[PDB]
Design a protein around this ligand. Structure first.
Ligand code: PRO
Ligand code: PRO
Ligand SMILES: [Mn+2]
Ligand SMILES: [Mn+2]
Ligand SMILES: [Mn+2]
Ligand SMILES: [Mn+2]
Ligand SMILES: [O-]
Ligand SMILES: [O-]
Lengths: 484, 478
């Protein structure tokens, strides 16, 4: 069959991946007692957008559910699936003659059918007529809440949909559940996005020099990912925090745009991941800017390496993800005590939620078409209202096929530390005279992408992780990647 | 005064630039008979967005009018200007404590006042109170039609605005007209964006090899612009057309994403331009993939070079831009006839609009904070309803301070050629025996950015342009 490919050494992705997703969705829907025979899934693809009121086009990236189901890269499409038969129909825009001048070849419907391996292709202006002819019982559309953004996913609509009976509640939980569990074909793509992003992280580590701006490494990373990986998009805005900025969790946005000069003695925390064909990667490397860990940097870093490997070693089906977050907390606290930053009973530290002072975010999250992937809090799975844990993007138990980030970290965040020092229940554990030395340290995060297997996990990421490995990698002299 | 700067060798842009823009806008409004005392300009900045319903953040780029007035890079702001005094007030978001954890330091109002060199800073939720206290006669908000997109620019709004007198018709044509005329400080930034983008184009020319994918050069260009120029954004999606794709004017979009392998014998047409602090550049370089012009490639290229230089040599204040388009048309037609592609009277070809078959787009456009900049068709300026000319993005007369692209091109576009061959009014001009050789040629576009000056123009762009220069640079000449 056909495959998506950007040539050179980039991954060929079979369009059968999407056909399998459509089949898996129908199979789930058929088992749902509420789903009527003759139902049709109706999805609306993303449309082209501009900057505000200007004609400056924004580069189009497909809506994630529509991509999962069809893998279609063109804007302005719709896609439907007959639940009972699994038959797929793609609706494509009927384009004007001038498109041939400005945008490119005007492809036939047959071209798209062959390209996307769907059962039928029609024009978007015919969708109402085509669906009517099929005499469906009900149209199943997509509406639900994303539990990371809190945004409501908006329903497909088209001229004349009012004449149909529409259900917008059944589909969202079902398609979300399918996305939670990755097929072998999806895993091949995620192995690839991790491979390229890992290589790019290595190139960045080799290239970092004191005196560079953070954004120079962001630029290099994205260039590696695009030119070598065919990754036109990143999975998210590159987080390139040096020095105190490594304590800022989602540093790098427009308000704090990776514009600090890297200084001797800084820790770097680089959280970056390319996207290939709308599949994510999400990797964080932490390392000394000057290629040599200080004693303090080694201690903090190896604390996070310990919780990372402890969690990965414990992960397997049936394990409760919040228990892993708590494991990481307990390990961080043990290590910070060994360093002399903390004193006292670690049991008591845990009871006082002291772990969340140093790791205020969740241990990790589902990953897939979206970097913060869907399905972390389905109905019946509650958010835990405690420091740290309340930021977890899922409270589910692990099952095979789930893809998760494992990203413990330790940070020195002034407002959290100040809060803890003011609280007598936590202050007693903190040794101010030692902690003071770590103000402005920043932080360390070690982020791997893994897949749950029948017996444990498979690690997708491949970057240097021990202190020795990192120092060796940064001292490497290969002019493997030297632009101009 | 403070300046915007991304370190290293990047340009320091004084915030005085935006102060001058506010002053110029007030001075223009004070002369407008529709404007009364006590008026306040109210603008609303862009907000953060995500991909669809996900929490995947889209990199924030400021709305262009707001940038022009304030130079503010943060999302969620408003900005007001007292017309009579020129006093500026920036309104910034009142952030949650957790912002300290996830997004970075919670800067004080005073930090922002110092950063942006405005007269006052307040929190956004206080805008109704602050404006109420100033007892304005009327709020002047921004609403109008962009004549390139057709989209309506939407008005500032805030909770409680309905208690104010609001006018949304006066401001738009005035602030557009200010944007049309670049200050010397703005020209400094456009010289810089052209400098970096020119350097990046030269790196691309040096790096291109047969067998590469087009997107590899897109990647390299953007990497040069960001790492060396501090240009995090491009002004528009890179158009990297090789071979037949060079005949596709806005090739490179999601539907045709620069994924062709460059072949020996191809012409490359690379239209790319970095953006610095929301100021554009827009440059096109055309060159042979293999670094050696064939006779046919040299002929088409030098035809476009001739019209580029004829137009640049003719541009001066008072010149009507549509006349420049027609000049380019005539030159292309003359040269296409000198090549044996066309025969007959060039006067007759022009009368038949034959030029538009080969250049179906406009000669060039205003450029500024937007690559297709505002103000091309103010009230009274009409779009000329003829092939080619109707695609012009302005029909104005040139005046000092305007910044324009000069981008003639010649393309071999099958459905336009075939139309002409079916049209008795045009078909006889075409020599199929020669034209057949150029089917699949693609096209050549030579795009320069220029400033209209008192005496003519200032050329901003600096890339190799002659055949000799191009072949030299592609063989790595310093
Ligand atoms: O937002 C999250 O869940 C992770 C933790 C910090 C970086 N990204
Ligand atoms: O859209 C325009 O005005 C020019 C013509 C082709 C490239 N951009
Ligand atoms: Mn990450
Ligand atoms: Mn993550
Ligand atoms: Mn251009
Ligand atoms: Mn242009
Ligand atoms: O992350
Ligand atoms: O252009």
């Amino acid at each position: 069959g056909p495959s998506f490919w950007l040539g050179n050494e980039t991954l060929k992705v079979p369009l059968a991946l999407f056909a399998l997703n459509r089949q898996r969705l129908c199979e789930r829907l058929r088992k749902n007692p509420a789903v009527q025979a003759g139902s049709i899934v109706v999805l609306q693809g993303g449309e082209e957008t501009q900057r505000y009121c200007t004609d400056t086009g924004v580069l189009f990236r497909q809506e994630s559910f529509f991509h999962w189901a069809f893998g279609v890269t063109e804007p302005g499409c719709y896609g439907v699936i007959d639940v009972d038969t699994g038959k797929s129909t793609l609706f494509v825009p009927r384009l004007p003659a001038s498109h041939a001048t400005w945008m490119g070849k005007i492809h036939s419907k047959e071209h798209f059918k062959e390209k996307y391996a769907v059962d039928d292709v029609q024009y978007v202006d015919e969708i109402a007529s085509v669906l009517t002819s099929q005499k469906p019982s009900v149209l199943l559309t997509l509406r639900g809440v994303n539990t990371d953004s809190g945004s409501v996913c908006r329903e497909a609509s088209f001229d004349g949909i009012s004449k149909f009976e529409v259900n917008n509640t059944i589909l969202h939980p079902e398609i979300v559940e399918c996305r939670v569990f990755k097929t072998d074909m999806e895993l091949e793509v995620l192995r690839y996005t991790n491979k390229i992003s890992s290589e790019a992280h290595r190139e960045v580590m080799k290239a970092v020099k004191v005196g560079m701006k953070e954004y120079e490494l962001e630029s290099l990373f994205e260039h590696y990912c695009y030119s070598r990986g065919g990754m036109r998009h990143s999975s998210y805005t590159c987080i390139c925090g040096s020095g105190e900025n490594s304590a800022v969790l989602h540093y790098g946005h427009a308000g704090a745009p990776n514009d600090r000069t890297i200084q001797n003695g800084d820790m770097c925390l680089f959280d970056m991941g390319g996207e290939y064909y709308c599949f994510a990667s999400d990797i964080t490397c932490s390392f000394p800017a000057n290629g040599k860990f200080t004693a303090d940097q080694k201690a903090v870093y190896e604390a996070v390496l310990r919780s990372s490997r402890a969690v990965m070693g414990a992960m397997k089906p049936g394990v409760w993800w919040p228990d892993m977050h708590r494991l990481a907390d307990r390990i961080h606290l043990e290590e910070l005590a060994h360093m002399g930053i903390l004193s006292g009973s670690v049991d008591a530290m845990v009871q006082a939620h002291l772990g969340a002072v140093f790791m205020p975010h969740g241990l990790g999250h589902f990953l897939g078409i979206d970097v913060h992937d869907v399905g972390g809090y389905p109905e019946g799975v509650e958010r835990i209202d405690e420091p740290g844990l309340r930021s977890l993007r899922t409270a589910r138990h692990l099952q095979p096929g789930m893809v998760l980030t494992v990203e413990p970290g330790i940070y020195f965040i002034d407002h959290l530390l100040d809060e803890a020092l003011a609280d007598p229940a936590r202050a007693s554990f903190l040794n101010r005279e030692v902690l003071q030395r770590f103000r402005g340290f920043g932080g360390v995060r070690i982020e791997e992408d893994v897949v749950v297997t029948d017996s444990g996990i498979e690690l997708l990421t491949c970057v240097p992780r021990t202190v020795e490995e990192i120092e060796a990698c940064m001292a490497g002299c290969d002019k493997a990647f030297t632009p101009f």
